Amino acid sequence: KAAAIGIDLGTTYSCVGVFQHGKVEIIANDQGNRTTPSYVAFTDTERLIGDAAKNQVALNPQNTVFDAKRLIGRKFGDPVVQSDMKHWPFQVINDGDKPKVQVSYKGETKAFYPEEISSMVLTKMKEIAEAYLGYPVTNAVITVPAYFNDSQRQATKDAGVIAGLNVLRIINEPTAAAIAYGLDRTGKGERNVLIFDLGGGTFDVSILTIDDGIFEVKATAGDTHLGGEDFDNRLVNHFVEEFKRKHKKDISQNKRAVRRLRTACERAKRTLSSSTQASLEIDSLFEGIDFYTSITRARFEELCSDLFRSTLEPVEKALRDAKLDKAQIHDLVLVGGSTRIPKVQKLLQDFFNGRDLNKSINPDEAVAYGAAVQAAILMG
Ligand SMILES: Nc1ncnc2c1ncn2[C@@H]1O[C@H](COP(=O)(O)OP(=O)(O)O)[C@@H](O)[C@H]1O
Ligand SMILES: [Cl-]
Ligand SMILES: [K+]
């Protein structure tokens, strides 16, 4: 009787939807946000999840955990883990070749498996859904990247079970986005679909063939370390330089000032997707000095031009691997918040010689939307 939910357990943001009464609704959290940071923070007094966790990241970098999706289902000695560890402010330890994130909580050293951290994010998403529906939720579909292996899939399912969910199915992110657009509904005959997923930390291109509702992954490409965070970073460096020029002071070694500037850059970037200019207004950025400035859409595009253009070669690669021409792609689907950037849409559309882009569902919601459809299907 309770509706089942669909959860996009994102690298940087998660999203939850529900299909009922003939339609999907993506559910807003307590702050009114339709996506929620995949962040968990531990303090002297509480555990914070989502917006509350991300909103104190500058204050508490050692104990604010993110990127758990990069660890989940991996062994400590996995080269990906050993590489990624070098760039996180939190500690990762080895418990019998399994990674654990080590933090301080309520004055004590504690360590958590990645699936435990992800379970906390999942608990938040479940609670968001429950506040909207007015009752406890017990069934969910959760999504994962197409490239996830059996261990990563099981660890993700385990995160759900820890969160108190019966996991109806673990399905691929690109498949979920296809389902969102009802591309699973055609009968006999192949339909080739390209999913272009540029999120906060990763870029995934998937080519799917759908034939009578059956999905085959034909090709995957991309970069697991290219996303919106890199665009924020280009803005950060730009403004660090601007602050140096205006005040003859370098803020780069002040972790707090840099992180606060980063937050302000992410906000301005979002504004630039719908406006041609954005203002930044940081109070007491550095040594009580305020930073009140502006950024145009064109300047932002300039600062990121190589990164935006770099998304096209993985499309070329995926097409080659799938042995398909551009014209053989029936549908182009935008996934990931970064695909809201007008210049990114232009690049992809131009590459496809003027083709329609499927973008009527907010790209940062498409995966949750499809997961919610599938959850309702599996419930019957
Ligand atoms: N309107 C927007 N314009 C540009 N970038 C956006 C916009 N909305 C969200 N983003 C970016 O999307 C990225 C997050 O992508 P999302 O699809 O929510 O999940 P994930 O990062 O988990 O793949 C972040 O870099 C965020 O700043
Ligand atoms: Cl262009
Ligand atoms: K996401």
Features:
monomer; 380 residues; alpha+beta; Nucleotidyltransferase, domain 5; Defensin A-like; 6-stranded mixed sheet; 4-stranded mixed sheet; 13 helices; 37% helix; globular; binds adenosine-5'-diphosphate; binds chloride ion; binds potassium ion
Summarize this structure briefly.
The chain is of the alpha+beta class and 380 residues long.
Tally of DSSP β-strands:
18
N/C terminus separation: 11 Å
Q: Supply Rg.
A: 21 Å
What is the total number of structural domains?
A: 4
Measured as a percent range, the helix fraction is 25-40%
What is the count of helical runs? 13
Q: What is the level 1 CATH name of the largest domain?
A: Alpha Beta
CATH architectural category of the largest domain: 2-Layer Sandwich
Helix vs. strand class: alpha+beta
Largest sheet, described in full? 6 strands, mixed
SS strand fraction = 25-35%
Family: Belongs to the heat shock protein 70 family.
Subcellular location: Cytoplasm; Nucleus; Cytoplasm, Cytoskeleton, Microtubule organizing center, Centrosome; Secreted
Binding site for ATP: 10-13, 69, 200-202, 266-273, 337-340
Organism: Homo sapiens
Give an account of the 3D structure.
The protein is of the alpha+beta class. The chain folds into 4 domains: 1-65 and 121-185 and 359-379, 2-Layer Sandwich (Nucleotidyltransferase, domain 5), CATH 3.30.420.40; 66-120, Defensin A-like; 186-227 and 311-358, 2-Layer Sandwich (Nucleotidyltransferase, domain 5), CATH 3.30.420; 228-310, Actin, Chain A, domain 4 (Alpha-Beta Complex). The protein has helices at residues 51-54, 68-71, 79-85, 114-133, 150-162, 173-180, 228-247, 255-271, 297-303, 305-309, 312-321, 342-351, 366-379, and strands at 5-8, 13-20, 23-26, 36-37, 40-42, 47-49, 64-65, 91-95, 98-105, 108-112, 139-144, 166-172, 190-198, 203-211, 214-223, 277-286, 289-296, 331-335. Strands 1, 2, 3, 4, 11 and 12 form a 6-stranded mixed β-sheet that branches. Strands 15-14-13-18 form a 4-stranded mixed β-sheet, with helices on both faces. It has a 3-stranded antiparallel β-sheet with strand order 6-5-7. The longest helix is centred in the first third of the chain and has 20 residues, at 114-133. It is globular and about 65 Å long. The structure holds adenosine-5'-diphosphate (ADP), chloride ion (CL) and potassium ion.
